[PDB]
Design a protein around this ligand. Structure first.
Ligand SMILES: Cc1cc2nc3c(=O)[nH]c(=O)nc-3n(C[C@H](O)[C@H](O)[C@H](O)COP(=O)(O)O)c2cc1C
Ligand SMILES: Cc1cc2nc3c(=O)[nH]c(=O)nc-3n(C[C@H](O)[C@H](O)[C@H](O)COP(=O)(O)O)c2cc1C
Ligand SMILES: Cc1cc2nc3c(=O)[nH]c(=O)nc-3n(C[C@H](O)[C@H](O)[C@H](O)COP(=O)(O)O)c2cc1C
Ligand SMILES: Cc1cc2nc3c(=O)[nH]c(=O)nc-3n(C[C@H](O)[C@H](O)[C@H](O)COP(=O)(O)O)c2cc1C
Lengths: 394, 394, 394, 394
């Protein structure tokens, strides 16, 4: 931290000695260049959302309709952007949201590792998807000293789900995010046009391929032993697909909580009574998301739901993602009451242009801007950033 | 059904064996490609609407301003999208809206037949226009086991109108839709620029040319017998035009109802007191439509009128069309209280690119998306999709 | 049919009674619309050529650098465009060039039969590829009275080769065209970018799966009998790929001449020594072609090669294709000494937009233009249109 | 590796099991994507040429004005594209041309090592620039069994020159290429507009900072010892600029031949007298090149100079670069008498998109196309592809 905004001193300082930037500085340039730098299947998969993508787009537009009220003569010369979440201190109110194909957003095929390493160097927590090229144990090592969270895609096999949760607790993950909006895949025209579904080609199934329950059950089903599977994951792509997506129930969440000491955080919550029942049932975190609009095109921007989710959540921490493109967006979601803000699409572009360093550049750019907005506009820390600081705007 | 969303499994499954899709997956691609695939007169006629087309466009824009609220932990793993309408069970809350030139949207000139056959294979009901290349008797056969409805353009000859209704009841049609907003043609710049009016060239007049009353009255008027007319329908285009468009009255609707046992459904209703008087007079169905904005450019999106039409309609079923482009749209209109949702322009593009199979692909794409939206967002059946599930959006 | 130019009076007669054309009237508008009416896989394969397609384009450009000299006061009010080829009288100095995926250029998937049907109606002869959806026996049937030719892709199996030739003879084809420039597929970036290759999916292999030799050999190689092959031709696709491409040798031509009475015509000849040597072999026809630039991007426009191929072939007829887009191109290549001119890409676009009638329209438009130019510019028949009527042009 | 053309069967085999390509398949799409995947400084420097870049463009255009004559019935079913150069057998008549910033064209900043690794896997020889990030000793190691060449930028310091040459010999390079057309940098508007010049920032100077002569001389001139130079090469950048560019003279060539056993190859020759005089000096190779139009915008396409440089050089091998974008260009320059052909800009785009594998893909695509053209058009080996197989074309 020192302050996050300091990052611009280094960019400007390097220019004075004839060293120009090598990466873009804004989302639009990140996206413009990344999309052309990626393979076409990956582009379709990462850029593409659900239906005509109105929701994915509305998520982003929502942020143009709040404004922060600037406060003069506050002298917010030292900012404190840290947040304490479930016992751990985060250096920044921001985290890498789960991205199951981030491995493939990077030219070397290890974008997930690259993401965890960027987390290690910045202190921006990495939330690893269940889908991945590096196993969740290797990820947690790459994440260093920085808090790391495990996002569970809950499978149709209780033994496997518990193996994932156990392995995550044993690997030293700091919390468990259960994604509630992706037990089945939404209608995605960009991927359907080219019949692009990479997991069914055996990509990003390392966490299944390495899991003892999956290995045992797939051998029972196919005759294939653990070595043959690891050498050709695609052999178990159809088996993966059959068990991948369990539709999670309230009773499931009570079960998960009783078998692990990790805090449980539910991702996909939009409705305040869903947030109410979760919190009243002892769930530890509420993660307001609509999955980037990638999974259902119902039209409701995530950000429209965050205020009532915050109120219903009470002192239970609320995470927010879906539509964050800049540091401005990050400040506005924090002001509405999110404790920490997830970053998706922007760091996938980071990966496409620069690997671990590109990801690190996105994270640091987003936080520099947020911190400089708080300084100029007179908010010295996140406790002072309250929802009454924002104003609706045409 | 099984579930309609299953359709995407087949697309993805075929790609895994090197079989790419051959048709588009989204409305914008349907429209972009269809419009270039059609003859220029047909394009002008099918794409074109009334005046500067603000209404046609506003119909579609309206849907961007409602959002479905996602419900988590509902486990809507088995969806029931069936609807019972006037005694018959529909497998889907969706139907092919009447399109008088759909015959000509297909390269082989039999787009109407093609539409009825797609209905037969999907269970999406076909509503055949009075205007058509296949006679209403052949259509009903092509429709198989699937409910089929007859849309009457009520002529200025009571004998003819009753012949159409009798023939439709005898052919086994399951209801009668009287279109109230097209007794006279609205100002249509795209067609006027090129003086394109295909019916006056004797196209799509099969139901008149085959009708005994029309044959008798046209011979009385012209001397032409039934064979000469059937070999040159254009001989009776001017006669058709003189009788085509009777302005329907309340008393007419009471007359129609008393001469047939088919349920009567009125299409074009926008105003709730019009819906009130209809329903209080015993009409069986209310079909909220503004005819795609093709006929009057007054500016009122159909969807803006559907909520008050639903309330005034009570337990009388309400059909909705005008502006549906995607499965998202379909869910939102159902949530507002329509019992079934009509599809227009999208399946005309289906016909232009793939005939009966293209039409079937549009229908199945629309329903897959709607069903997957209901699953992800936690609505298990249409009874659970209530208007309070929607939220207005900027 | 008094002269081909009369076709225009039909198009103008119909507009006078308000019947507008439904198909485009120039190659540019056929290509534009047709390319949007096609599935992306068919588009890529039909439009795409070899390499960066310079040769494909340069083939077309070459026609811009010859001009026909108009001759006034010749009164060419009656034109004879007939040509006598191998003892049959062609109504038109034009033919449909072999296109192996033409079946798939038409929405109903039988564009090959539609091409034969258009040839039966126009008098424009059809040359069926070895690759097709309809058997070569049924193509000949569909071609009516119009002379029809069979284009052989000589396979790596003399038995199969001989059964193809004996079948074509027995089906009553009037010539055997042997394609010499596709025993191996060239670098085609459009298809490679999406790994598009329809034959390996068992598409268009009917002439192999109907063949008793192919059946026998494929059964020995796989255990699958003829009915199962008829119902899943893809079972045979890798076996087809193994024997498809035989690099034809001089001695093979000798061997083919001796087992058929059909005239043998060699397609792909570009160099005069190759032609002179063919003609001294006793080859019956020379088919000057570079396959539309689709197999090899060597850069030599096929038209640059025609004059010297005509001269080296003496009395033997020379057919020409590669770059013909209009009836002006037709006239020019005839003028250089082509006895008959082949159309490829234009009639594929015809199929994509009108099926049989779209194909017929392209053919009658090309011949209407060619005839009208001869009429206006003073060439009453093909004997008067010689290379001395052309001038090189900037 | 039976023939280079087989590469295409891999790309098509993978699509059949739903594995789509991830890299582009033509130069146009490499350039388009790659230019967007690069930092703007690398883009400017790699894409930019001298002046208004007419020469850079005209080098490429010249290949559009030669066409290869196809020869039918030659049965070139086995092709020999091998070439013997200075007592080593090249698997391919193609090599990676020297590119001093290739390291920076790859996201990991070691594109020079990745190029050598692609050469070790392909058999396509690598020519390392004097400018590089990896030492010339490590480049040779990375190149495995594949012949490797060292490109000398003769410095203004005979000691340093001689240590470079002795190092390359000792590292086991198989030739010394001396670049003659860059002892001073030309007017490059793209770099000048943003004052872009990576060497003066101490980038790509490893071969100088690893060099004992450079160290000694630079230490006398500044007091900085070798370790500090290793860690801040920019300390030496102005000193590098002072001795970089020596205008090589005839006597210098003489002096170089005498202190190495390596074959000496002169790069930049365009005029026949310069070549004839080189060959009579006893120079071992002629490298016809205008540096891709990057140093001087004089306007003469390098390809216009090759035929007469081949003739003036008699038995001495001639290498060719400048304008090669596809395998068609490769074939044409070989046909004019180039014994081997160099690739520049295409493999830089390869690095920017795939690193080593992107480079390998460009090289195998170029050679697949070249081979397939020879196969289709009847040239079984390089001895048969002569200038008499080409025709000038409009
Ligand atoms: C390519 C991609 C893949 C995704 N992968 C997953 C995943 O594996 N797990 C998950 O819970 N969410 C998934 N996310 C959703 C993110 O976690 C986050 O909800 C979303 O990206 C926020 O939307 P935005 O990128 O539009 O801001 C994915 C998002 C993207 C862009
Ligand atoms: C080309 C075309 C022709 C039409 N034909 C008729 C018809 O014969 N009968 C009728 O009641 N409505 C007619 N419809 C209206 C549809 O039944 C429906 O009201 C309308 O298309 C819905 O608007 P949308 O296509 O913009 O969604 C027509 C619509 C189109 C697009
Ligand atoms: C889609 C397509 C497929 C082809 N398939 C065949 C074939 O099966 N047999 C053959 O000898 N040539 C084939 N060719 C070459 C054509 O017969 C003809 O030589 C070529 O199309 C002429 O060039 P143009 O289409 O650029 O005018 C094909 C051409 C096209 C456009
Ligand atoms: C970015 C770049 C840097 C260059 N650097 C070198 C170099 O270090 N040494 C050299 O002899 N030539 C160099 N050249 C010239 C190339 O070796 C080759 O002659 C040239 O790229 C061929 O032209 P083309 O790239 O337009 O085909 C370079 C070329 C490029 C594109």
């Amino acid at each position: 931290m020192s302050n996050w905004g300091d990052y611009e001193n280094e960019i400007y300082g390097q220019g004075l000695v004839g060293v120009a930037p090598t990466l873009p500085m804004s989302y639009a340039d990140w996206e413009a260049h990344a999309q052309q730098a990626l393979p076409p299947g990956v582009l379709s998969y990462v850029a593409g959302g659900s239906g005509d993508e109105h929701t994915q787009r509305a998520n982003v537009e929502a942020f143009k309709h709040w404004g922060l009220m600037p406060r003069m003569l506050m002298a917010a010369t030292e900012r404190d952007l840290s947040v304490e979440l479930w016992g751990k201190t985060w250096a920044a109110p921001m985290f890498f949201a789960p991205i199951g194909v981030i491995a493939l957003c990077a030219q070397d095929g290890h974008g997930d590792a690259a993401s965890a390493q960027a987390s290690a160097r910045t202190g921006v927590p990495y939330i690893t998807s269940t889908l991945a090229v590096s196993s969740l144990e290797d990820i947690r090592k790459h994440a260093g000293d920085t808090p790391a969270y495990f996002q569970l895609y809950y499978p149709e096999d209780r033994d496997l789900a518990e193996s994932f949760i156990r392995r995550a607790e044993e690997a030293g993950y700091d919390g468990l995010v259960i994604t509630l909006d992706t037990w089945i895949f939404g209608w995605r025209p960009r991927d359907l046009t080219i019949s692009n579904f990479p997991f069914l080609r055996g990509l990003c199934l390392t966490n299944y391929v390495t899991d003892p329950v999956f290995q045992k059950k797939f051998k029972a089903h196919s005759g294939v032993e653990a070595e043959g599977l690891r050498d050709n994951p695609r052999l178990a792509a159809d088996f993966w697909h059959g068990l991948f997506g369990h539709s999670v129930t309230w009773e499931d969440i009570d079960w998960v909580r009783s078998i692990t000491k990790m805090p449980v955080i539910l991702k996909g919550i939009q409705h305040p009574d869903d947030a109410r029942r979760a919190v009243d049932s002892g769930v530890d975190g509420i993660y307001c998301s609509n999955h980037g609009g990638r999974q259902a095109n119902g039209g409701l921007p995530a950000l429209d739901c965050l205020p009532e989710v915050v109120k219903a959540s009470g002192d239970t921490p609320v995470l927010f993602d879906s539509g964050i493109r800049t540091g401005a967006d990050v400040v506005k979601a924090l002001a509405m009451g999110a404790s920490a803000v997830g970053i998706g699409r922007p760091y996938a572009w980071g990966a496409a242009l620069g690997g671990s360093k590109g990801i690190e550049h996105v994270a640091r750019s987003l936080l520099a801007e947020a911190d400089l907005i708080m300084a100029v506009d007179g908010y010295r820390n996140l406790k002072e950033l309250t929802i009454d600081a924002l104003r609706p705007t045409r």
